[PDB]
Structures are given as structure tokens and as C-alpha cells.
């Protein structure tokens, strides 16, 4: 019944209650949790929650633009824009205004590929913490490039290079947007740097891209022409710089600085974007706020999520589990002891988690006192950040099974299992896999939990590939992760072996396989 | 109920009792210093107690900028933003356009370098001054360039200038923000200077460093690529400076007017910068306060501190001691007698203080009068510059120990120390320190405290380095702390010996190795 | 309770006492003089008793700008800036671009000079007045140029310029303030005069400083690089000023016309400094008070102060005598008879007094009424020059003694003297002043007192340097001021002796070497 912000919703609805329904409010009671209603916990004693330019009022009533992804309704999450640049197919050509000789490669992108490419595994894990640590870090703003038909041929010989004059670089490029929120006057600037040394930048003024890119959406409408760089004309290269392409190195193309602006409603109709702009809530949201990303194989996101400070007893903002934050930031469902997408489960378990040192630290640090030991009871806090990935593949031997092999010796009749059933053990575990099903020249890490209700059995695991190994594995009768890389190589080889073979009585559950990064092809 | 200035805050609390909580304001009664809440002193005869655009009040009750470092909503402490910048690498080019000879050299940049440049060392410290001075004093502003990969070669060989016609310089460089205040319109002029002689300046205006710099945030957010000063675009250089150059001297940048705007609540809903600047309160905040900077081998910070003006009772301004100063400035947890960070420690006997010239004197003058004869219990005065210095390797053989080896022939089952424990003594102490953990080409002084209630049980010590050499100490019965210094070279050479031999009776305590500065290397 | 101008301060306590306490004027009654309260008096039939715009009450309240020095917190005291600019490195290029022949010298300022560069000396001083004569008056504004890195070698060597074109000049300036007041909005415009002959004027904007200029602070913030002209641009010369500077002459500055703004704090938040302009102010200042400069060695400072119209009974006004109008526009303590600084001795027997024509007229005309013989006893006049020149060296055998070589046959076994002490004499008197610390082609006056109680008792004096010089001086009864001149020559020389010989009853006492000006120099 009382106010304090220039909000409708009372000081005592803004703590441990919150419904919002025909436009007033309402307190929650949990009767209609069924009817499409979500739990929203914000401020009171700040009108805005985070560093959105919304009032909580208007991001929790959907008087708001359209175009804003409906995940950042609740006030915990705002609409923070990113720009981001994909590289897909180049051509190298000897002249400056377009004969000569041209030669042309297509190219797969990599959005969450520098994140977890310094990411070292060890081979046990140690107490409760279930995750791994990065050496950099860095968010989907920046690409990396992967070159698929890449036959055994020097790019020096198709282009006839003798001293000192070198050719130059063309491309076409797609602006993807990995966030709940759009922008209108998009004017981006990006950097292609191989391994450090700047070659050249790019801005991509107004009128060539056009008035908007709505979240979700890149200007090349899904599968269309992609936009060349020739419509700020053409990017020049040395006698240096071929050979570290060629050998080792990958072009990165990375946005520096984004500006643009967007939409707030009017009293009469619709959008204005005159007098207002994205350049004063980037440190208004990023000081505030963590930042977690979720990869699956298909897609990416990224959502900013307003945490607590410890040293400041005052501050009275809405405290969060881990797992409450990503189920808030990114939208799922509460099944039975489980959070669920629309298709992929998401668990400590079933996907891989990657943190920074600091973030690693303060996890370690907090963990000692809690007497659970799962990675989801973890309280949040301010300035870290969290890398989920989605495995490509996954079995939890039960509804779900996407491998597009079948197992072998595989015995469904168990309950003692982390979640569900398990496989019985009694010989071999064998499975194969074409290789033209996985994507060549890669870094694969397979996941898997054992238990053993014996003093000292032991098991082994084969993986053949081209680096094919043997591995000993020793479990206990608590629950042990384990987790193998390997590399793969082109199509033209043979397949992928994964076998197992133990003394009949241990239990395997939760098995994954996902992929990491991309490795360096001689040429 | 009386007041005195146009703020919330009771005229009778404001001296020696300050508390907020929720929004209003209550006395201090000593009694919840452990539920986080603290106290802070302000001026009762002025609303703005320090030189920034905030009131006290609102300062302390966090009604400001969020992007503003937490520990700056201390009312004693203004903020004040100080832009740096500094080179990562080099390259020489002889073309304008951007063929020819080129050359590549990778550097580092340090911020504290010519302000520990003039600083000489001795065998004893005389009196109860535990501290040094320095020739000329400069803040972190500018930076110095060490370059390290750099084998045996002149710069004229891999160029080939014969008697006047000299190549062009080009640069990648950072800029970062060490300091609790942020900017909006960044405008920096920096001059890039070769001993002197200024090569040329660079204006970096809006489009290259972006709208925004958060405190603590370099311009590329955490780990990216360096920006190249290719987007006024190049600058010349002679055959004069080069040879200069090559022999002895390092290039310096320092910027010299830095303009921008700070940002505030209007009177209804967001932030605005436009009718701002932060160009009039510069000289209005350096003519109040003082100065003390800290440097960790990790970061760096410097605050202004407001003081009070011995030679003036009209000035009804609360006082300081230097401890208080630290704790009210930095943010550090208070232990029995032990100041605190999250892991570095620091105190009386555990880094290294340096002053000025006149500083020096006011503390010496002082000193005398103390009856305590440490250095932290004294009062504060305007205008006077200290500088702290956290040792990259320090033990005090206690609870904090980092060393990249292990001391030998330890008895620490001892209480007769400065704090706790102390090294007791009946052979030798011997340490063969690796180069492959310390940084090449550099300065650094190794620094104890000895004690021995004895008549005259010397001890000896012995430096094995490229510059070797062996001392005595004789010991007295007060405290005395001990100070040398050694050069190092590259890292292709032996370990570093450090070696100390008594009589079985001293007790060594605090021992500390740190850098100081940077020797010019024969090329 | 009676009340004249716009102050709340009422006319009684406006004359004999001024004391502030509590924002609340207060009586003078003579108890708490050593409580750091001082006495002041102001006009009563005007709101500004100074020129400054403030008035008396708001500049002795300290509710003013925080950066003006607390020297002007007396109503007596004008708060007036003062640019000055100054030259510390010469470059001649052949070339309007940047390659060519370049020579670069360092060269230092001297900007109380060309004030008393026409001053000249007599054997003996003539009743009381113990000042000096010079022939032209120049404030701080101008400053002069002198080369010390230069060897025998003509400036046409380094440049052969045969019959008709000669190079372009560049040159390393810095600025600075001596005043009581800071300007933000500073508008340079000097003028570099050479021998009558104006050579270029320098309008350096606004961009090349910015807004800020600091009492006593130089735009390069202590030790940092000398700003080049080279960020309107190049300045030539011709083959009939360039054999000039060889011989005789120097090259001058002087500043002609500058502009700013003062700040004012408004009613509610910060200051504003843009509806303002000191050009409204400057003829209210400079048409009333008088000048008083002081000259260390370290720093210069010039302050004016208003003073009483003696043919003017109607203008109720101030008066005040010279020691009195000293220590108020500087800030003095009182020692018994004396004036003293923190370390610096100031009086009538200590420093040098140089006086303009009109001024010393006047004096001398003041000084035949006086019963006193002291030179601090005279009332003010507006319109008169005091130019107050501290020696680099001075000792009278008391707390103070400073020259860093000893004498010989010190005899403090005295109690006749002006203040404490007198040196006894017996025989020879020797000091041998060495080369390290003389500054080079520098002119020095060394002055002393004497007494001796017999009726012809003479003593003789030798002055050996490169240019000796031998004199016999006759004392009197009471005390006498003698005072001697000579110049230096370069490094290679040998080190300066001074000599002076009596019979063994004579008594010397205050010896003063000062600086004068520069010699030319013969290239
Ligand atoms: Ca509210
Ligand atoms: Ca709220
Ligand atoms: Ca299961
Ligand atoms: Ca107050
Ligand atoms: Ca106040
Ligand atoms: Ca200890
Ligand atoms: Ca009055
Ligand atoms: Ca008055
Ligand atoms: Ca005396």
C-alpha cells in the first residue's frame, strides 16, 4: 500500500510476490502458476531495476516495442544490444577496382570459438566443482573462421607471388544479432587482424544496411544473397601475412564499437528513434550485471543479468541461484527436479559449463560451506561469467537419444541412476561413427558419469581416431565424471570407435559428446 | 535539528556519527561495525565536502552513477578519471602509403617508471624514516615502453638509412581508465616524446575510441586486439633520434589535456551527459586534496584525499592519519593491527612507501615529535604525494606466503616477531630464485628487517647475480631494516643466488623482493 | 548596528580589528592572536575593497572558488592572474615542412630580469635609503632567454647561410601562473620581440591548453616534456637579425593581451564560467593598486594591494606601511623585529630593494620626516613599485647559515649586533666559493654591513675571480651597507675567492650575494 518510485506497484509487491494481470497488480498466492503467469522479483528503492531504458512497470506490462524479445519481460533481465559479424566465403584477386586471377574458398563460422579455445581438461575432477577454466574470455561479438574445402594446395601457387607484391582481399559478410533487443541506425565498425597484426577496418555506414536488423534476424533474410564487400572498397595484404594464413592462423573479424538507436512509445502511436541512442547504458547495464551465454550447435544467445554485492548490506536487489538466473535469463520449464528448453535439457549433468579464473575461484571459495555440493546452489554475484555448451550429442539412456548410431550391449533394466535408469555392465560397450556425420579438422570432448559399488574395479576406454588412445578409468562408489578430447581429419578417412570394456558390475550414465574449437590444417 | 548546508544530514550528527540506512540518516553507536554498515566524516560548513558535482549525502546514500567504484561512495574521497595510454608493439615501415623494409618488435608498458627513476638506495635508514625519495614525481598518466624481444641488432640494419632520409613509425596502442570516475566524450591529446624532443601528438576525437570508458575497462574490453594508429594518420622521424633511440633511451607518451562530460539523474527519468564537463573541476579537486597512488604487479589506483590545513582552526575540516587514510581511500579489512585486501596485505614493514622531496621534509620535521615513532600516526596535510609499492615476492613466515620456492632451514616455532612468528636461526639461509619467473632487463631491491638482542653478532650476505657482490650487517638492538639492490638480464642465463650467514642468534624477519625500474640495454 | 554597504558586517567593526568565526564577524581584543586568527581592515564606503570581484565578506568567508591561494583571503589583497610564457629549447630548421639542416640548443628562462637588468651600483648609500635605481620597470609578463649549452661555434656554422635566405626557427614553450587567481577561458597572445624588432606573433587558441591554468602550476605539470609550437606554425628570419644574437642580444617574450573567465559559484549546484570575462576587471585593478613582485630562486610571485591617496582627504581608505602591506599580500610570521617566511628571511637588512625613478623620488622625499631611519616605515601610495629580490645566498652568523663552503676566523662571541650576534674580527677573512654551483655569464652584487667603534680604523676587501677587483672601505659608528659586483665566466675556470682583511676591532655582519642579470657573451 506503499510507494516509493513513480511505479503503480506498492514497495511491499516488489518483494516476495509479484503478479501482474489486466494491466494491475495483483499478489501471488500459487494458485494460477498453470495459467501463463511467471514470477517476477525486482527493486524498491530504485525505478529501474537494471540499465535498460525501461521503468520496471513498462518491461513487466508489454508497453513496450515488439521487436523486443518477450525473455526479457521480467525485471532481473534487460534489453542489452549486440552486433555481431560473420565471415562466409573469399575470394583473393590481384587487381584495385574489381582481369587477373581469382581464386575463391567458402568458409564455415564459429561464434563461441575464442571463449573455449584455451580450455585444458584434466582427467578428474575435483570435489564438487563439475566445470573447466578458460585463459581469456570473450563474448560473441567477435567470429572465428574455419575453412572446410581445403584440399592439400598452397594458396601462394594458384596466385603466382614471386618478391613483393601482394594481392588483395574480398569477402562477403552477414550482421547477426545475438541479444533481446534491435537496433535502427546500425553503423558498426569491425576489425579483420590476423594474429595481431591489423590489416584493415570496416564500417558499413547507414544506407546498406538499412533502418533496422530486428533481434534474432540478420539483414541476408535466412537462406538469400549474402553482402559482399563491394557495395570501404577493397583491403590490401602484404608478403608477410599470406604464409600465417596459410600455415597456422585464421582470419579473426571482430566489431569494435556499435552505436545505433531505438524505440521507446510514444503518447499517440508508434515508434519515435529521433532523439535518443545506444551510448550511454553500455557501462550503465555491463557494471551491474553478469553475463551468461548458452551455445547450442544451431544457435547462440546472451542475456545480462543484474546480480548482489556482498559488502553492501543496504543494497537490497533480488538474489539468485545459478540456476534460477539462467531459467530467468533464457526461459524454460520446471519439470520433476529437471529445467527444460523447448527440446534440449539443461542440467549440471547434461551440458558442459565453462567459467573464467575469477569466477572459478569464488566458485571453489563458496562451495566449502554448502553441504549439497551441486553446482546450481551457487548464490550470484557481480562481474562473472558463465559459458554454457549444448553437446551435439547426448544419451541419458532414457526418452532422449540423439546419436545417429545405436550402442551395443546396452541394458535399460537399472534404478540406481543419477537420473532415471542406467546401463548394466556385463563386457564390451561398443559404438561406431560414420565420419561424414562430424565436422572435419575439430576438437571433440566425450562426457560420461560411472559409478561402482565395489572396493577395486576398474575399467578401460578405447577411442579410435586419428590419434587413437587407451585410457584406464578407476571409480568408487561415488559418482565419477569423466571426459576425453580427441581430434578429428577429413572426410576421406575412416570412422570414429568408441569402446569400453570393464569386469560386469559398474554403472554408466549421462553420456555426451561436444564440440570445443577448430585445429590447425598443413598446408 | 539544526542545520547548516543545503543537505538532509543534522548539523549536531555530522561530526564524529554518520550512518545511512534506508534513505535516512542515524548516529553512530558503535555497536554494528560487523553487519558491514561503517561511518565516514564530513565537513558541516559545505554540502559538497570534496571538489566533485555531488553532494555528501547523496554520495554516501548511492543515489549517483552506478559505473562508479563502490568504495568512492566514501564522502572523504573524490572521484577524479585519469585516461593512460601506452604501446603493445612497434613497427618501422620506409613506404607513406602504408612496399619496402619493415620491421616488427613486441613491448610492454609500465605505469610506474619514471617516478621510481630517481630513487637511489642505501645500506641503513636512519631515525624512524622507513621510506625514500625520489628526483621528480609523475603520476600514473604516463607509461614506459620496455621492449623485450630483442636479440643482438641495430635498428639500421634491418632499415638501411644512410644519411638523412629516414623511415616512418607507426604504433598499437591501449587506453585505459585507473580510477573511480568514468567519461563519456573521450577527447584526448597525448604527446608522444622521445626523452624531450616530441616527435609529434595525436587527437584521438570520437570515432576511434568510442563513446564510453568505464573505470577499470581498457579500450578493448579485456582480452582483444590492440588498436593501430592507421584510422592524424602517421608521424615522422629522423636520423637523428633513431641511433639515440637504439643506445640509451625509451619512447614515452603522456596525454595533456583530457576532456569529457560525467553523468547525472535529470529531474524525471534517465541519465544525460550534454550539459556537463569534466574540465572545471580539475584544478578544483588537485588544489584541496591530496594524492596517494598504489601499484600492484597486477593493476594500479590512485585517489585524491581531501585534507585539513594545520595553519588554519576557521577550517572546521575533519583529520587524518596515514593508515586511515589508506583504508578510507583504498577499501581494506581491518585486522588486529593489519590492513587487508582481498589477498595482497599491506602495512607499516610489508611494502615500500615513496615520497617527494618535500614530503620528505614535512615527515621528518614530523617525526620527531611522535612518541610512538611509526610512520602511519601521523596527521595528514595538503598537498604532499605519497606512492605505495606491493612487492612482487613477500613473507613474513606466517599465514601469508607466496614464494616460487621454499625457504630453508626454517624454525618459525618462535613469538618474538613483529607479528607472530619470526625466523630463528643456526645455519645458513640459502635461495636460487629462477629467471624463467621474473621479467628480463630490470632493477630489484631485496628488503628485510633484522633484530638481534646481542652485542655485536654480525651477519653476512651474498647476492649472486650479473652483477654479484657480498655485504656485512651488523645488527643492534633496535629493529633495522635492510635495503640492497641487483640487476638482472635475459632470460638464457643461470639462477639468482641469495645467500645469508650469521652466528646463530639474529632473527630475520619481512622479507621482500620487488622492481623498481628499467636499465637501458646495449644495442 | 550601523551599516553602509552591501555587507552584513557593520562599519565600526569594519576599522582597528576584523576577525571571522561561525560565518559571524567578531572584535579584536588581543587574547587570541596565537589561536591562527588574523586581523584585517576594509573600505566602508564600497561593497569591493579590492578590485577583485568579490566582495569583503564572501573573501573572508572562504565561500569563494577553492582554487584562489589563501594569500587573498585579506580584503587588502586583489586576486589577479597573471600568464606568463616561457622558452626552454631553440631548434632551427631550413625547411617549412618539418629534412635539413637542424641545430637544437637548451636554454633557460629568467622572468624578473630586464626589471633590474638596468640597475647600477654605488660605493656608499647615502642617507636612509638603502634600495637601489634601475632605469625601466617590467612585470612578470615578459621573460628573457639565456643559452648555457653552447660552445665556441658561430650560429651560421651550423647552418652556412651564404647571402639571402636564412632558416625557420621552432621552439619549446611552456606556461605558467603568478598571481593569486586562476583563469579557465585563457586567450595567449605574445609577441617574440627581438631587440625592438618584432619577429612573430603566437596566438596558441584555445585547443593547445584547454581550460585550466592553476595558480603557481605550469601547463606541463611539473616535470614532463616541453611543449612544442608545432601543434600559427612557423616563424622566419632574415640575414640581419641572425649575426645579431651572436654578439650582444637575446631573444625576448612578452605576452601583449589575455583573456578568461572566473568562477563563481551560483545559488544552487557548481560553478559557471561561461557568462564571464576578465577584461571588465583588469582596469579596475591595475588603475588603483600598487605592484609588489618577489623574486626567489625557486618561484616568483606578484600581488597587488590598495593603498591611501594622501592628497585626498575625502578617500576613506586603508593605510598601510610597506612591512605591514608585505605580510598581509604574502603571509608572514612576526618574529621579534623580524619577518620571516618557512625558511625564507625577509627585511630591510636581508633581501634587495630595487625601486622605480617615481618611486624612489617619493620614498626619499618620505624619508627625511621619519625619526626612525627604517626603510618599512613609509605609508603607501597608488602607483608605486616594489621589486623585492631574495639573495641566493645569506648569512648573519645567527639560526640562519646556508653557504655551503665555511668561512675562516669566526668569532661568535659577541652580543653587539642588529639581532643577536656579530662576527668579531681578528685578522684575514677568507671564503672560496667553487665552480659547481655558479650558475655561468651571470653578473653578482655581494653586499654586507659594518660598524667598528674606533675613529680610523680601515679595512680592505680583494674579489678574485677571473675579473678581480681590490677596494678599501673606511666604517663609521653605526651600521654601514657596502655593496660590491662581479661576473662569472664558463665551466673551465677556476673557483671564486672572496677576502676581506681589518685590524681586529671592525664588526661585519648580514652578507648577501645576490643575482643580477646577464652579460653577453663574446661567439
Ligand atoms: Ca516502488
Ligand atoms: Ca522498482
Ligand atoms: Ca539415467
Ligand atoms: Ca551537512
Ligand atoms: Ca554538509
Ligand atoms: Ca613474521
Ligand atoms: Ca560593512
Ligand atoms: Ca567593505
Ligand atoms: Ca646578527
Partial sequence: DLD???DNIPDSYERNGYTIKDLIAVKWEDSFAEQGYKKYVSNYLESNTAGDPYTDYEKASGSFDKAIKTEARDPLVAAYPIVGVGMEKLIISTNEHAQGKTVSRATTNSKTESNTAGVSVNVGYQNGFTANVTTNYSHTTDNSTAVQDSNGESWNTGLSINKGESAYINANVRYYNTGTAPMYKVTPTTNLVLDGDTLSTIKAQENQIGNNLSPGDTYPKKGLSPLALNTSRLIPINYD???????????????????????????????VTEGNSWSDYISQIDSISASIILDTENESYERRVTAKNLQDPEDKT????????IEKAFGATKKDGLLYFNDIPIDESCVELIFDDNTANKIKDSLKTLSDKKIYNVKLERGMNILIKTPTYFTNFDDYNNYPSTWSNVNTTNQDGLQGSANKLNGETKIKIPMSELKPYKRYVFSGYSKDPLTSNSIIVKIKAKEEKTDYLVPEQGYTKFSYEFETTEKDSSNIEITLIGSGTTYLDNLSITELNSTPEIL
Avoid at 241 to 270: M, P
Avoid at 319 to 324: A, S
Fill in 241 to 271: 601475412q599470406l604464409k600465417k594464413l596459410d600455415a597456422g592462423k585464421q582470419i579473426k573479424l571482430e566489431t569494435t564499437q556499435v552505436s545505433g538507436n531505438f524505440g521507446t512509445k510514444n503518447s499517440s502511436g508508434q515508434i
Fill in 4 to 6: 516509493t518510485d513513480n
Fill in 318 to 325: 533480488p538474489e539468485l541461484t545459478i540456476g534460477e538466473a
